[PDB]
Amino acid sequence: LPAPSVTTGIVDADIHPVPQDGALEPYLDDRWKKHIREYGVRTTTGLQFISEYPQMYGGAMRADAWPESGYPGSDRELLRTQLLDKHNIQLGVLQCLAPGGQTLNPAGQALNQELAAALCRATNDWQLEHLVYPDPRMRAAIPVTFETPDYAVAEIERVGADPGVVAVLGTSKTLEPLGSRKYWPIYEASVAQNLPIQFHLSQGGGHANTGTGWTSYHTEYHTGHVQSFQSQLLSLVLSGTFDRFPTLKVMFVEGNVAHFAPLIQRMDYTWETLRGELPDLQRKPSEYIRDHIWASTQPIDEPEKPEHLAELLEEFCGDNVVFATDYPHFDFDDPETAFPRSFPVDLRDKILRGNGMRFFGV
Amino acid sequence: TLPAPSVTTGIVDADIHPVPQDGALEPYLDDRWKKHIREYGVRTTTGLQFISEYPQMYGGAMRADAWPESGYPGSDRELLRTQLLDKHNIQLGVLQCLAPGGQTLNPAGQALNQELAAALCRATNDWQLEHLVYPDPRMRAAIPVTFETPDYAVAEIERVGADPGVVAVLGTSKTLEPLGSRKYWPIYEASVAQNLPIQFHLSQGGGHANTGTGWTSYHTEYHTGHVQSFQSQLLSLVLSGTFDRFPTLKVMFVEGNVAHFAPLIQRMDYTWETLRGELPDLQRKPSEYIRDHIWASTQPIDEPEKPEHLAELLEEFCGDNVVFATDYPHFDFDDPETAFPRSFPVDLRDKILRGNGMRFFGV
Amino acid sequence: TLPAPSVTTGIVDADIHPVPQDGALEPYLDDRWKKHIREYGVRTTTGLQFISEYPQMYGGAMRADAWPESGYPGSDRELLRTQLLDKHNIQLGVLQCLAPGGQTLNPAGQALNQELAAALCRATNDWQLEHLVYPDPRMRAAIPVTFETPDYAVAEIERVGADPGVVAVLGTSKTLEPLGSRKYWPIYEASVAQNLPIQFHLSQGGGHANTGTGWTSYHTEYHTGHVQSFQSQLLSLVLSGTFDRFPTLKVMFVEGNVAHFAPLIQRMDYTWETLRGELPDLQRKPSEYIRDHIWASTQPIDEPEKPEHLAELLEEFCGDNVVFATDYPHFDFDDPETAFPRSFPVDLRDKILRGNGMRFFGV
Amino acid sequence: GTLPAPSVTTGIVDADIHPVPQDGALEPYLDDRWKKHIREYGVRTTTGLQFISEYPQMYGGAMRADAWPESGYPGSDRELLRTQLLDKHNIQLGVLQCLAPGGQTLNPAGQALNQELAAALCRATNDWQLEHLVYPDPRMRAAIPVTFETPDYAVAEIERVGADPGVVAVLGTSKTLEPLGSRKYWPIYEASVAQNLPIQFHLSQGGGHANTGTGWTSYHTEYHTGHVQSFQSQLLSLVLSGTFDRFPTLKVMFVEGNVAHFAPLIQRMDYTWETLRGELPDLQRKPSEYIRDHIWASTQPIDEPEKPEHLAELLEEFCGDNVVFATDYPHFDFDDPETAFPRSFPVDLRDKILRGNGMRFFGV
Numbered sequence A: 001l002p003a004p005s006v007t008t009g010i011v012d013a014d015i016h017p018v019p020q021d022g023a024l025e026p027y028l029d030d031r032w033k034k035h036i037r038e039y040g041v042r043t044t045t046g047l048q049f050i051s052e053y054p055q056m057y058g059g060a061m062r063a064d065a066w067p068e069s070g071y072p073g074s075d076r077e078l079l080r081t082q083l084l085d086k087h088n089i090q091l092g093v094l095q096c097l098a099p100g101g102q103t104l105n106p107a108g109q110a111l112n113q114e115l116a117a118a119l120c121r122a123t124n125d126w127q128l129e130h131l132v133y134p135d136p137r138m139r140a141a142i143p144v145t146f147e148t149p150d151y152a153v154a155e156i157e158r159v160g161a162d163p164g165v166v167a168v169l170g171t172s173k174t175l176e177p178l179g180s181r182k183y184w185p186i187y188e189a190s191v192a193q194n195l196p197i198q199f200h201l202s203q204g205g206g207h208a209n210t211g212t213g214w215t216s217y218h219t220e221y222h223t224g225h226v227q228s229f230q231s232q233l234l235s236l237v238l239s240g241t242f243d244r245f246p247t248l249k250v251m252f253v254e255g256n257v258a259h260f261a262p263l264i265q266r267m268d269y270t271w272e273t274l275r276g277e278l279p280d281l282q283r284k285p286s287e288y289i290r291d292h293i294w295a296s297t298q299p300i301d302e303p304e305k306p307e308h309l310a311e312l313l314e315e316f317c318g319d320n321v322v323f324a325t326d327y328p329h330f331d332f333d334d335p336e337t338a339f340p341r342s343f344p345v346d347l348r349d350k351i352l353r354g355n356g357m358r359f360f361g362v
Numbered sequence B, C: 001t002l003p004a005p006s007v008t009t010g011i012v013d014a015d016i017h018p019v020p021q022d023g024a025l026e027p028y029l030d031d032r033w034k035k036h037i038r039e040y041g042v043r044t045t046t047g048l049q050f051i052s053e054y055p056q057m058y059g060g061a062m063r064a065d066a067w068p069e070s071g072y073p074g075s076d077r078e079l080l081r082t083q084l085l086d087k088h089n090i091q092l093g094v095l096q097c098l099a100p101g102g103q104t105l106n107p108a109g110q111a112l113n114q115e116l117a118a119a120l121c122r123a124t125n126d127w128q129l130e131h132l133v134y135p136d137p138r139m140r141a142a143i144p145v146t147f148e149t150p151d152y153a154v155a156e157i158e159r160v161g162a163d164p165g166v167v168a169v170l171g172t173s174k175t176l177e178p179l180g181s182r183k184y185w186p187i188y189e190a191s192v193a194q195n196l197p198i199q200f201h202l203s204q205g206g207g208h209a210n211t212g213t214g215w216t217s218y219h220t221e222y223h224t225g226h227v228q229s230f231q232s233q234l235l236s237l238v239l240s241g242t243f244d245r246f247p248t249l250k251v252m253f254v255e256g257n258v259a260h261f262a263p264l265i266q267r268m269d270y271t272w273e274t275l276r277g278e279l280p281d282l283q284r285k286p287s288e289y290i291r292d293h294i295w296a297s298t299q300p301i302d303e304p305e306k307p308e309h310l311a312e313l314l315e316e317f318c319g320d321n322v323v324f325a326t327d328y329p330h331f332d333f334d335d336p337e338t339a340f341p342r343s344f345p346v347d348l349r350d351k352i353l354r355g356n357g358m359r360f361f362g363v
Numbered sequence D: 001g002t003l004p005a006p007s008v009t010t011g012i013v014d015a016d017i018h019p020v021p022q023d024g025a026l027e028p029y030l031d032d033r034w035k036k037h038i039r040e041y042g043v044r045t046t047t048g049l050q051f052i053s054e055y056p057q058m059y060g061g062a063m064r065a066d067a068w069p070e071s072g073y074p075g076s077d078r079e080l081l082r083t084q085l086l087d088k089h090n091i092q093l094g095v096l097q098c099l100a101p102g103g104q105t106l107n108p109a110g111q112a113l114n115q116e117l118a119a120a121l122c123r124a125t126n127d128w129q130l131e132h133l134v135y136p137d138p139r140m141r142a143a144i145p146v147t148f149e150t151p152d153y154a155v156a157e158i159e160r161v162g163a164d165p166g167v168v169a170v171l172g173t174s175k176t177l178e179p180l181g182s183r184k185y186w187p188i189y190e191a192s193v194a195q196n197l198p199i200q201f202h203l204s205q206g207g208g209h210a211n212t213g214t215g216w217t218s219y220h221t222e223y224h225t226g227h228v229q230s231f232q233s234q235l236l237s238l239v240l241s242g243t244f245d246r247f248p249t250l251k252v253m254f255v256e257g258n259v260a261h262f263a264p265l266i267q268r269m270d271y272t273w274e275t276l277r278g279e280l281p282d283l284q285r286k287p288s289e290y291i292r293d294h295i296w297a298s299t300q301p302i303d304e305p306e307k308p309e310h311l312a313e314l315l316e317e318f319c320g321d322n323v324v325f326a327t328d329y330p331h332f333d334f335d336d337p338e339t340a341f342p343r344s345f346p347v348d349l350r351d352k353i354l355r356g357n358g359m360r361f362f363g364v
C-alpha cells in the first residue's frame, strides 16, 4: 500500500467510522461472540447499553449524515462522497470509538481486558479491510488496550508496521496519568514501529469526569472534556516520559487547543520555583512541546475577538496544530469555514497540510 | 550464611511491626532522596504533609506498655526482644515495616513518587536485615516492595529476595487495581522465582475510597472497614485465574480478619454455580483455590458471641491456612496464651500457632 | 554490532542448509568432545555408525549442480552466495544446520549423548555466526539446541540467543514426547525471553517409528511420511494449551508442507465441537490459535492437480502465516521464480516472500 | 502432621504392601473437574483399552484367594490388612505402595496420559493413605506416588507432603519413557534428597515402550518373567549416567524386580566398563561400587534356585546389606517371612534382610 501523499488536498486527523451490525464477527473468536451476546460489553458503569453521559441531541451526530440503514459513519460510500471527495482529504485518519452503532464506547475500556483486546484487534482487521485498503486516502489509528500494556504491545507488533496504519489510538481518560511507567511499554512499542500516538476524548477511565466530582449538566460534561487533556499533558511532560522516549510523538484529539497555551505557561512558571522536586527532568517543561505534543483543531476554539485564536495557537506551538473535521459528529468543522475571517493564511495552510504531514511521517 | 528458620517448641508470629529509629534509614538512602523527604515528606494519596487520612485514635493505636524510654513502640530492638520474642517464645517472627519513621501506618510503597517509594523500600529492607534479622534471626523480613510499579518491585525481589533473612514479599491490602489484575503478575512471577510467598497487610491509601461506596466517618467504620478490601482482593485473585497462571503462588491476607472469608467464599461458589459462564477460562471451582493459595493471619482474633462459632468458621475457611500473629505493638495485640476460646480444639490451635505458618513460609 | 535484517527488493528464505567443512567445528568443541567423536562418532536412535535409518537416495538428495570443487553441497560459502543469495536476491536467509559435517540430515540435537549433543549445538552456533552470518549478514541463524534436554537448550539460548545474527531457535519435527508436553515449556519460556520464535525442521529419529503405525519401507512412504509428524505436533501444541501459557510464542513448521494443515485444523475444530469437554481449560477454539502462533514454510511447494486449489488451501490454513523457503541445496529446491502457479495472486505471494516472514522473525 | 519416626524393635520391615482405596474414597480429595473427567473418560494411559491394562491379570486378578474382604477388592479393608498381615507377621514398618486409584489391580496414577489428572490422583492418593491408613496405624508408612513423567508436578508434591513423618519414600514405576538416569528425572531426585527421602520403583506395565526391548510379549510366562528386564535397564542407566555422582546421598530400591539377576548384570557391567569406560570418563566409581551406597532390592517374589545354596551366594554377590524383605500382600505370589527363605539360609543374612537392611534404607 503506498505511503500517504498529501499535495493539494488536506489532512483530517479525526474521522469516526462505525462497523455495520455484525461486521466485527468474522474477526472475533467464538468465545467473545458468545460473551457479548450474554453480557454485552461491561465498562466503568452500572449500565447495560449506554455510557454514563449518553449523547444528548440525536446522538450528537450531523443530522445530514445518517445513511439508508445504520448509524452515521457506517456507510463507506457516504463517507467517501460527503467527506473525502467533498473536502479533498488526502490523509484521513480513522478513530473507531465504538465496536457497534454507538457514538462513544471504546473497545479498550471494556473491564474484561481480554475482551477489550479482542475488540481492538477485530476493529483493526475490520477498518483495514473495509475502509483503508479499498480507499487508502483513509489510514487507521489503531485502538489498543492502554490499561493492559502486554496486550497493546502485542497488537502494535502485529499490525503496527502495516502501511495502512499511521498511529496508535488511546483515550483521554485512564486510571493513571499517562506519564506513569505503566504505559511506557506501549510507548516503547510505538516508537519501535515509528508510530505516533493519538489520544481521543473519552468518558470512563476509572475516575470521575473531573478531579472534583461527577458533572450534572451537558455544558459541564462537554466543556469538562478539556480537563482530562490538561492533566495528561502535565503528566506526560513532568514525568520525563519524553526523556525516556525522545522520538515519541503524542497528539491530543478533541481536547481543544487554546487552553494548552496558558496551561503550559503556568507549568513553566510553577516549575521555575518548584523544579527541585523533579531534578531528573532534562528540559524546561515547555521545551518538550515542539518535539512531542500536538493537538487537533476540532471543535475549533471561538474567542469573542477572533484575533485571539491565532495568538493562542502560536503560544501553544503553531507547527503542532493539525486540522480535523470530527465527521460525522454534530460539532463537525468544515475546512472552508472553521477558521475566522482574519486568520493568517500561512498558519491555516500548515494546519491543513504540513503540520499533520510531519506528525504522521508523510 | 544465616541458618534457615527453625520452629521447635516456640511459635510463628506472622505480623510484627518494628520501626526505624530517627535517622536509621539514612545510611541506606542517597542524599537526593534525603533532601526530597526533608522538603516534600513522603507524599501519598492524601492532601496531608505528615499523617494519613485516618490518623490513629487513642495513643497512636499502640499498646500503652510498649513505649521505650525514648522513641516509638517497636523502635527499641531490646524491648521487642524481651516484651515479645522472649515473652512468647516466638521462633519465627515476621517483620512487616509499615512506616519509614516513628509512625504507625504510612507504607513506603504507597509514596506517589514511585522512585522515592522504591528507594525507601530498599532502605527499609537493608535496615531491617542489618538491624533486626541478622542480630536475632528469630525475626525474618517480609520485604516491602512497590506493588504499583512492578518493574521496581521485581528489581528489589531480585536484589534481596534470596537472602535467607527474607521469608516473604510485603504488599498492601489496598491497590489501584484489584490484585488479580495482570499489572501485578510480574511481581507474582518474580516472587515464585525466589520461592517467596506474598503477605498483604492492612493499609489505607490505594487510590480509592476506603469502601466501595464512600469514605468512612467514625473509627468503628474505618477499622471494621479494613475487612472489606480483603474481601475484594480475594475475589479478584481467585476469579481472575491468577492461580491458574501461578499454580505455586501462596498469598496471605494479614490483619483482614478470618471468619468473614468463609461466608464470602460460600457466596462466591453459590453465585458461580449460576454465573460461571462469564469466566470460562477459570480452571477450578472458586473455593478449590483456597487450600493451595489463600492464607489468613488471625489477629485481631474474631470474637463471636458463642465462642464455638470461631473454630467452625475457621474450618469453613480452611483450617490448614490460618496462621497466628500478635500484631505487636499495636493496641489490639493478641496474646497466644489468651486468644483462643476455651472449647477450641487443640489440633487447630496447634497448627495455627506452628505448623500452618511453617508451611506458608517454607520452614 | 550487527545491523538488523532489512528486506526491501529481495526475499525471505526460511530454510537454507549450510554444512561445516571437515574440521570446521573443532575450534569450537572442547577436546573431550573431539575425543568422543573420534572414538564413538555421533550415536543417535539407530544401530548405524555413520548414516541415519533412511539414508538419501540419488546423489545424497542434493541438487546435482550444487557440488563445490571439494566438499559437500552447502559447505562452500562462496557457492552459497553465488548460487543462492545473489541468484535469488535473498535478503534474509535463515540457516538451519542439519548435520555437523558433510552429510544431508543428521542433527546435532539428536545425539543420544546429550552432553555431546549440547556441545555440538554450541559449536555449530559459534561456527555459523563466525563463518557465514557475520561475513554476509543477509544470512541469519536458526540456532539448533537440545530439545530433549531443556536445561542445556535454555543455557544455549541464554548464551547466544540475543546475538543479532540469530533469528530463531531450531528444533526437529520428531521428538520423544509431543511438543505440547510440559517437558519443552522451559525452552518456550527461554525463547520468549529472548524474543525468539521457534522453527521445527523435518527430521528422522525422535525415539519412535517414523509413522504412528510402523516403520516405512519405500522412499515414497518415508518422504511423504514427513508430513505426519508435523500434523501430530500441531495437534499437541494447540490442544495442550501451550499458547495459553505462552501467548507471544511463534512456531514455524519447516518442510512439513502447508496445504494439509488446513483440513487437519478443520477436522480438529469439528471434533472439538463435540469433545471439547475433555480439555475444558483450553481458552480458544483450536483453529483460533493458528493465526497468532503457527507458521509454515512452503518448500516443497504443494502441487494440486488444479493449481487454483493451492491459494485456496493456503488461505484456509492462514495466508499471513505462510513463509517462502528454497531448501537449498536439496534436490527438491524451490525456485521463487517458478514455485507458484501462474494464476496465483501477487499479494499472497508477496506476503509469502516478504511480509509474512518479516513478521515471524520480527524484522 | 506429627508422628514418631518408625521404630523397628523385635518386628520386621515389609517394603511392599498394596492397599487400595474403597470405591469413592478419593473423591473427598479431588477437585470437581477431575471427578467429572474420570466419570466421562476414565483414566486414559498407554493403551487403547477403557478399563484394563495391556496385560490383565491371569487368575483371579493375581490375588491370593483368601484376602478378599466382605465387599471390596483385596487390600481395600484396613482391619483385614491389620489382622491378616501387620498383626500376623509382627510388621513394625510396613511400606504402602498404592498402585491404583481403585479396585483395579495395577494401574498407576502416575501413568495417566493426562498428567494434570495424574498429579491430582497422586495427591489424592497421598492425602487418603495418610489419613485412612498411616496416621490411624503408624506401623504403616507411605511411599508417595508422584508423576515421574512430569517432574514439576512431582517436585511440588514432594515439597507438599514429602516432609510428613508418615511418608518414608517416593514411589515410581519400573517403566518410564526415558531411562531413569536421564536428566529429566534429576529434579525429582533433587527434591527427594532435600526431604531425605529414598525412592522405590515398583514393577509396572506401561511407560511408553513395549514391555521388552525387542517386542511385546505374548504369553503370561513372558510377561511376568519379563518384568525383571525393565529393572536391569534402569539399574544400568542410573549407575552409568553418574546420577549417584550428582546425588551422592540418593538411595533407590527396585521393588518386585527380583534380586539374584542383578548380580551377574552388575558383573557384566563392570567387565564391559573395564574396556569401554572411555565413553563415560566422568563417572567417579567403578559401576559395581555404586550398589552399596545407592541400590537396594526387595525380596518378593523370592528367587528359587535349583540348589538353594545359590540364593545366599547371589544375594551376597549383589550386596547382602541391600536386600530388604517384602510380602507383596495381598498378591498371589505373596511371600511369608517364616517360609520364604530356604531351610539352610544363613541366619545372620536373613535377620538383616528382615530388619537391619530396610531400616538403613528407610533411615530408621
Ligand SMILES: [Fe+3]
Pocket (backbone or CB within 6 Å): A014, A015, A016, A200, A254, A326, A329
Ligand atoms: Fe472525534
Ligand SMILES: [Fe+3]
Pocket (backbone or CB within 6 Å): A254, A326, A329
Ligand atoms: Fe466528537
Ligand SMILES: [Fe+3]
Pocket (backbone or CB within 6 Å): B015, B017, B201, B255, B327, B330
Ligand atoms: Fe499489623
Ligand SMILES: [Fe+3]
Pocket (backbone or CB within 6 Å): B255, B327, B330
Ligand atoms: Fe495493627
Ligand SMILES: [Fe+3]
Pocket (backbone or CB within 6 Å): C015, C017, C201, C255, C327
Ligand atoms: Fe530443509
Ligand SMILES: [Fe+3]
Pocket (backbone or CB within 6 Å): C255, C327, C330
Ligand atoms: Fe530438504
Ligand SMILES: [Fe+3]
Pocket (backbone or CB within 6 Å): D016, D018, D202, D256, D328
Ligand atoms: Fe508389589
Ligand SMILES: [Fe+3]
Pocket (backbone or CB within 6 Å): D256, D328, D331
Ligand atoms: Fe505383586
Ligand SMILES: [Mg+2]
Pocket (backbone or CB within 6 Å): none
Ligand atoms: Mg515565554
Ligand SMILES: [Mg+2]
Pocket (backbone or CB within 6 Å): A272, A273
Ligand atoms: Mg527563580
Ligand SMILES: [Mg+2]
Pocket (backbone or CB within 6 Å): A280
Ligand atoms: Mg540526568
Ligand SMILES: [Mg+2]
Pocket (backbone or CB within 6 Å): C161, C162, C163, C164, C166, C167, C194, C195
Ligand atoms: Mg534477536
Ligand SMILES: [Mg+2]
Pocket (backbone or CB within 6 Å): C241, C281
Ligand atoms: Mg495447564
Ligand SMILES: [Mg+2]
Pocket (backbone or CB within 6 Å): B280, B281, B282, C280, C281, C282
Ligand atoms: Mg474452560
Ligand SMILES: [Mg+2]
Pocket (backbone or CB within 6 Å): D162, D163, D164, D165, D167, D168, D195, D196
Ligand atoms: Mg521424613
